[PDB]
Amino acid sequence: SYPAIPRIYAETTLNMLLKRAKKPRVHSIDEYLKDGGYQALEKALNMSPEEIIDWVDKSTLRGGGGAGFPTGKKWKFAVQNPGPRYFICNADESEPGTFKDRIIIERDPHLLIEGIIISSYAIGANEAYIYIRGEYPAGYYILRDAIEEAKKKGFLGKNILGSGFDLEIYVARGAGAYICGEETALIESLEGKRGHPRLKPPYPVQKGLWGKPTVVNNVETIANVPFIISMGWEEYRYIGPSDYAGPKLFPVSGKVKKPGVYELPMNTTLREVIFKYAGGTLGNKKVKAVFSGALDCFSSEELDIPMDYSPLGFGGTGTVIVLTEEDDIVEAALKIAEFYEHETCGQCTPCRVGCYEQANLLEKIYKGEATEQDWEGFDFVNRNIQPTSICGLGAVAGRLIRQTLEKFPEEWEKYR
Ligand X SMILES: NC(=O)C1=CN([C@@H]2O[C@H](COP(=O)(O)OP(=O)(O)OC[C@H]3O[C@@H](n4cnc5c(N)ncnc54)[C@H](O)[C@@H]3O)[C@@H](O)[C@H]2O)C=CC1
Under the rule (CB under 5 A), what is the footprint of Cl ion?
43, 46
Pick one of ligand SF4, Cl ion, Na ion, none as the site partner of residue 139 (Cβ within 5 to 8 A by kind).
none
Distance in Å, CB of 26 to other proteins, minimum? 15
| DSSP letters spanning 18-85 | TTTTTSSS---HHHHHHTTTTHHHHHHHTS-HHHHHHHHHHHT-B-SSSS--BHHHHHHHHHTS-S-E
Task: Choose, by CB under 6 A, the member of 14, 33, 47, 67 that binds ligand X.
Answer: 67
Pick one of Na ion, ligand FMN, other proteins, none as the site partner of residue 203 (Cβ within 5 to 8 A by kind).
Na ion
Task: Choose, by CB under 6 A, the member of 69, 141, 375, 412 that binds ligand X.
Answer: 69
DSSP-assigned beta bridge partners for residue 248: 264
Distance in Å, CB of 182 to ligand SF4, minimum? 7
Q: Does 308 bind ligand FMN (CB under 6 A)?
A: no
Rounded to whole angstroms, the Cα distance separating 396 from 340 reads: 9
Task: Choose, by CB under 6 A, the member of 59, 221, 281, 389 that binds ligand FMN.
Answer: 221
Question: Are 215 and 274 in contact, with CB atoms under 8 Å apart?
Answer: no
Binding site for Na ion (CB under 5 A): 5, 92-95, 98, 103, 106, 127, 133, 174, 177, 179-181, 203-205, 345
The 3-state DSSP class for residue 233 equals: helix
346: CB partners within 8 A, 6+ apart: 352
Closer to ligand FMN by Cβ: residue 323 or 391: 391
The 3-state DSSP class for residue 98 equals: coil
Task: Choose, by CB under 8 A, the member of 53, 290, 323, 381 that binds other proteins.
Answer: 323
Phi-psi region of 211 (alpha: psi -120 to 50; beta: other; left: phi over 0): left
Q: Which helix (H) or strand (E) holds 151?
A: helix 137-152
Of 22-30, 168-176, 366-374, 397-405: span binding a copy of itself (CB under 8 A)? 22-30
From the list 38, 30, 47, 36, the residue with the least C-alpha distance to 155 is 38
From the list 12, 70, 97, 58, the residue with the least C-alpha distance to 268 is 12
Distance in Å, CB of 376 to ligand FMN, minimum? 28
Closer to a copy of itself by Cβ: residue 7 or 342: 7
For residue 297, which amino acid is it? C
Phi–psi pair at 134, nearest 5 degrees: -65, -25
CA distances from 178 to 8, 42, 370 (A): 22, 36, 29
Task: Choose, by CB under 8 A, the member of 55, 75, 87, 99 that binds other proteins.
Answer: 99
Residue whose beta carbon is closest to Na ion: 174
Task: Choose, by CB under 6 A, the member of 40, 53, 63, 245 that binds ligand X.
Answer: 63
Question: Are 346 and 310 in contact, with CB atoms under 8 Å apart?
Answer: no
Q: Does 57 bind ligand FMN (CB under 6 A)?
A: no
Distance in Å, CB of 151 to ligand SF4, minimum? 37
Rounded to whole angstroms, the Cα distance separating 27 from 56 reads: 26
Rounded to whole angstroms, the Cα distance separating 192 from 225 reads: 29
Closer to Na ion by Cβ: residue 40 or 105: 105
Closer to other proteins by Cβ: residue 105 or 385: 105
Question: Are 85 and 214 in contact, with CB atoms under 8 Å apart?
Answer: yes
Distance in Å, CB of 71 to other proteins, minimum? 23
Taking residues 120 to 159 in sequence order and writing x for each that binds other proteins by CB under 8 A, - otherwise, the string is -------x-----xxxxxx---------------------
Distance in Å, CB of 82 to Cl ion, minimum? 29
Sign (positive/negative) of CA torsion 290, 292, 293, 297?
Answer: negative
Distance in Å, CB of 316 to ligand SF4, minimum? 18
Rounded to whole angstroms, the Cα distance separating 41 from 26 reads: 21
Q: Does 294 bind other proteins (CB under 8 A)?
A: yes
Pick one of Na ion, Cl ion, ligand X, none as the site partner of residue 43 (Cβ within 5 to 8 A by kind).
Cl ion
Closer to ligand FMN by Cβ: residue 146 or 397: 397
Binding residues for a copy of itself, rule: CB under 8 A, are 1-2, 7, 9, 23-26, 152-154, 157-159, 162
Binding residues for ligand FMN, rule: CB under 6 A, are 63-67, 69, 90, 92-94, 179, 181-183, 216-218, 221, 391-393
